Amino acid sequence: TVFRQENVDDYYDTGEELGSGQFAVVKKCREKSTGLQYAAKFIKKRRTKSSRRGVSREDIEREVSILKEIQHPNVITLHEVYENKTDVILILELVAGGELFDLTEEEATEFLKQILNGVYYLHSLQIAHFDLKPENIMLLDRNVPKPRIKIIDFGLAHKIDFGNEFKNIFGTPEFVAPEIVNYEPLGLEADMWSIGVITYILLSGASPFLGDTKQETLANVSAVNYEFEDEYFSNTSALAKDFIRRLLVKDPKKRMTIQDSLQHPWIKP
Ligand SMILES: O=C1c2ccccc2C(=O)c2c(O)c(O)cc(O)c21
Numbered sequence: 001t002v003f004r005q006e007n008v009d010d011y012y013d014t015g016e017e018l019g020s021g022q023f024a025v026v027k028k029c030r031e032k033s034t035g036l037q038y039a040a041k042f043i044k045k046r047r048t049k050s051s052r053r054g055v056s057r058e059d060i061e062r063e064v065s066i067l068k069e070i071q072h073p074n075v076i077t078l079h080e081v082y083e084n085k086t087d088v089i090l091i092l093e094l095v096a097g098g099e100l101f102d103l104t105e106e107e108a109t110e111f112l113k114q115i116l117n118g119v120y121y122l123h124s125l126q127i128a129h130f131d132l133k134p135e136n137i138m139l140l141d142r143n144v145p146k147p148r149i150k151i152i153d154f155g156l157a158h159k160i161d162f163g164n165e166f167k168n169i170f171g172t173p174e175f176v177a178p179e180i181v182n183y184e185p186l187g188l189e190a191d192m193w194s195i196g197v198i199t200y201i202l203l204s205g206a207s208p209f210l211g212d213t214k215q216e217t218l219a220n221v222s223a224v225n226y227e228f229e230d231e232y233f234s235n236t237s238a239l240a241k242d243f244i245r246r247l248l249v250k251d252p253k254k255r256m257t258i259q260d261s262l263q264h265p266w267i268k269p
Contacts, residue, residue, distance in 0.1 A: 074118030097139030189252035196247025204232035
């Protein structure tokens with residue numbers, strides 16, 4: 001699909017840089033016609049068919065197609081798309097409150113419940129995010145009594161219409177499920193593993209699989225080499241550990257689903 005090729009600078013003024021990704025830079029911006037504020041994600045296009053630099057148009061279009069389906073309070077929403085020779089520019093809802101990690105169990109579950117609601121939305125649409133990790137969990141406004149989380153960064157996300165996708169889809173070693181590490185078929189279940197990692201870090205401030213090098217982390221993930229350290233998890237409830245234990249499970253078929261996680265006694269009201 002082709003996107004708007006007028007100069008984005010004719011319709012928007014860009015501000016401070018918000019953040020980055022590989023082959024992407026995110027800048028604050030303001031639409032001239034409404035005065036409304038957005039985040040402009042500039043994604044660098046591949047210059048040739050065989051190039052390693054930049055993002056292939058197939059990958060850019062997938063991210064855009066998924067974003068267009070999404071309207072939920074816990075997920076970032078897409079406003080407009082522009083392009084030129086160098087970049088595709090996604091005009092995205094501005095999420096200004098920072099990364100969530102930037103805790104009591106009540107406070108953790110408060111944010112975790114919103115993450116689960118957002119992932120429940122995506123999985124209901126057969127969308128696997130595949131990139132879930134703390135830096136992709138943002139706060140809309142951190143000055144409100146009840147801060148809203150928004151899931152961001154759909155750059156790895158895929159529709160799973162067959163129940164699994166066989167592709168090389170590989171995120172950050174600390175957060176990827178064993179089936180990603182092992183290059184096996186992937187599905188919504190990989191997101192549920194990442195949720196278990198996030199939950200472990202949310203409660204303890206420690207990363208369950210993190211090794212001294214990337215290969216060590218990957219090896220730890222594939223072997224499910226983690227434990228709840230007493231120093232970190234003393235005074236953490238047994239139900240909280242139960243919730244994590246049922247997510248960090250090598251066999252994707254045995255892992256809790258998003259529906260299971262919402263009915264788990266630690267989460268369920
Ligand atoms: O880094 C950021 C980022 C940093 C500070 C605020 C918002 C964002 C943000 O919305 C964002 C995306 O939506 C994305 O799709 C990839 C990103 O890297 C970011």
